[PDB]
Structure 1
Amino acid sequence: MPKHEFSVDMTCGGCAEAVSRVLNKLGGVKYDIDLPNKKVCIESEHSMDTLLATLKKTGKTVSYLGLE
């Protein structure tokens, strides 16, 4: 399974929670948030570039940072 790690500018809990609703627009995604570490850890059969573009709808510094 493709457990990939992404970091996003979670300057706020509302500013973070937005990542849930944009990933739900794809729907076919599994994910888990770490609010202190600023991480979303994802697994889906969709591409890393689809996930990255979807997270960047939330208006932030988003960086893909490798594999678990």
Structure 2
Amino acid sequence: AEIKHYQFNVVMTCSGCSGAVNKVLTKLEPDVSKIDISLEKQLVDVYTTLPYDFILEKIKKTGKEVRSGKQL
């Protein structure tokens, strides 16, 4: 199956916010292969076989502001 690369600008200028994002992604193992969170750029990179819309909805349901997303 394709391992897609999604990138999101997520506002994580808040205590616990990067961890909230990590957590929802851990629940989607074993079909999430890699995640990167950069506080220097406020970016979350997700490498996964799962659909974009599903990753986006799960990140949004953390209540953290998702400014934009891309498939790369």
Aligning the two structures, in what range does the TM-score lie when normalised by the shorter sequence? 0.7 to 0.9
Q: How does 1:1-68 map to 2 (within 5 A)?
A: 1-27=3-29, 28-29=31-32, 30-62=34-66, 63-67=68-72
Number of residue pairs aligned between Structure 1 and Structure 2: 67
Q: Where does structure 2 lack aligned partners over 5 or more consecutive residues?
A: none
4+ long deviations beyond 6 Å: none
TM-score normalised according to structure 2 size: 0.80
Q: Deviations over 1:1-45 (max 9, x none)?
A: 422211101112511211111111111212110012010111111
CA RMSD, 1 decimal: 1.4
Kindly indicate whether the alpha-carbon contact (under 8 Å) linking 2:17 and 2:64 is maintained by their aligned counterparts in 1: no
TM-score normalised according to structure 1 size: 0.84
More strand by share: 2
More helix by share: 1
Percent identity, aligned pairs only? 43
